[PDB]
Amino acid sequence: SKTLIHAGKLIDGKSDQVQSRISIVIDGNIISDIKKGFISSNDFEDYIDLRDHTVLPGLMDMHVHFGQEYQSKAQAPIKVEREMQAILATQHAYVTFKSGFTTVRQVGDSGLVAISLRDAINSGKLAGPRIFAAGKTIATTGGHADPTNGKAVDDYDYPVPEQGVVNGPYEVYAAVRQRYKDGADGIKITVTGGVLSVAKSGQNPQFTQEEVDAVVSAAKDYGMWVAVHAHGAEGMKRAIKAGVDSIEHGTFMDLEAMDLMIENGTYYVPTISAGEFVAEKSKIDNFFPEIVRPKAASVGPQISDTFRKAYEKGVKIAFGTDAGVQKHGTNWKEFVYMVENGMPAMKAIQSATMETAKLLRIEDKLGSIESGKLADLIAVKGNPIEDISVLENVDVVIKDGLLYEG
Template identity: 60%
Template sequence: ENFTQNPADYAFKSVKFADVTLMAGFTTVRDLGGSGVNISLRNAIARGDIKGPRVFTAGKAIATTGGHADPTNGYRKDLMGDPGPREGVANGPEECRQAVRQRYKDGSDLIKITATGGVLSMAKNGKNPQFFDDELEAIVQTAKDYGFKVAVHAHGAEGMKRAIRAGVNSIEHGTFMDDEAIALFKQYGTWYVPTITAGRSVGDSALIPGYYPAVVVPKAIETGPQIQQTFAKAYKAGVKIAFGTDAAVFQHGKNWLEFGYMIEAGMKPMDAIKSATINAAELLGEKENLGSIEAGKLADIVAVDGDPLKDAKVFGKVVFIMKDGVVYK
């Protein structure tokens, strides 16, 4: 698609995805990286031009050369070129600062970086650390100067530990966190966003012959089932957890499946609900406006048909949706 889809194509697709996400009962989402149309999508929803959830977006994610979010991985150099900080590829502290400032110029709400390898990128290592300490520190300090929170894609333990020590706000996936990483999560108060649904999806898809390129398959098979196991360990240890799914790795609108996977792994149903409401609002820095039904907060209310404390499938049976006082269903 990188060779055949224009930004306008992605924009029109995103309109549909925004609609199905809102109608699944998700009134606010955090978007952690895309082509750049995500900023325009946020603005269109905020203006009321289209229907969708309230969007907090990172714009384009930031990676190192060859890193998980390098948009040219696996493609011909003569067709794709060598991206830099503007496109989300930064090497060394100065380029890292420049990349954060570019996100500010672009209109991003937060910063997303890929601190380790990933599953679906066209590179063989899905766990290796991909930023040095001084690069991470430059990103975090610059982000603070501009009022940004920093979300970090990380599968491997070393990359996530470097990121936590640098002062980032959240770790996404956290697949291979070890005991030292868990201790750091608790010491620094870092949020963990597990994305179990994405892990289950890639693990299942990797078993279908030809579904993924050969370089992706072993990473997906190793990583997919592990996320839920890691989540269970982190939850039991008392790590702060916020709800997140990595939608687009699986079908938009199926985000509610995450509740079931979290509960299946040992989380109390009410804790799962809190992870998607008040905890998520705190991670966003929007606890004063979102996350609970209180006087003075935005009127976001969702109702389901049944008792979700007894049956996780009920999360997928949304019968009422209100966002900012407007009823959509």
């Protein structure tokens, strides 16, 4: 038994051309065939008529944080138990999945949220996207991802390497191995200061070359990719030269960093949305903590500008929003931002399909609508190439050959 889909229009992920009237055949969780025109459907077990829709391969977001959504000081709850993070993550994942993103890379949570959610989803306990998690983001004492920042002296215990806070190359290995132990698919580190952390710096280098080299060599031994938070150029370059797979945000990326990324084939995940988010919010008094506000006003506005520079220079780019800052499910806005800043619509869609698939090392199974690959497809009314914002209304989502939406 097989499923036949009549696609009015088709963006396959590889071809720079929007193809008209195509037949996609699904067998199990695989795309078994692709024929031109609308072939007869009377002989197929199931038929999905999307002649009035534009079909695309499942979309991917390389930077999400299911389990959290940034709230102002006035709105933020007093505390958030781990159980609450997990509970909220189920909903965050579902709305993201329903909006068209069938695969996501969670690069940071308290530790076991995305890992547990991924396992529950993969074993059919609930619906959601394919999740590739990094578990606890690794940082150095006081770093952007140190979970004990913003706490009075007697209100916290100094973190140990296994908890994601390290100093030196040996503690780095302990931390990387701990993520492997927790069940993570990859590694995430904050190579420079950050914005939303209750800490002084928003961009200083927080990993020594020896420490970030240790991250790469350790992750390589465990077959783990390495995503890297970085705003300041210096920390960013220590990571690019070390051989990490991707730089997130890269706010103050300079000319040298750009050529280094091109030479090493490093992926750039802009998260323009999150950038615009903190900018806008930085104008509201007491929205952010006082120590955070300055950083948000500085970093946020520069991402859109850095994005254009990186794109024109030829830096590899993969789709990433940093959803968990802004509300989950608004991932599509990232496309509109990428376009307004110089990237043509089709190139933008390819950055969330094939480019993301390569960064996650799964391009041979997902990322495009081609015979043999896994059946992850979405559909929407309208032409994304003429107005990519139409992607806000994805109304059909198929994952692993199964239809959830539509």
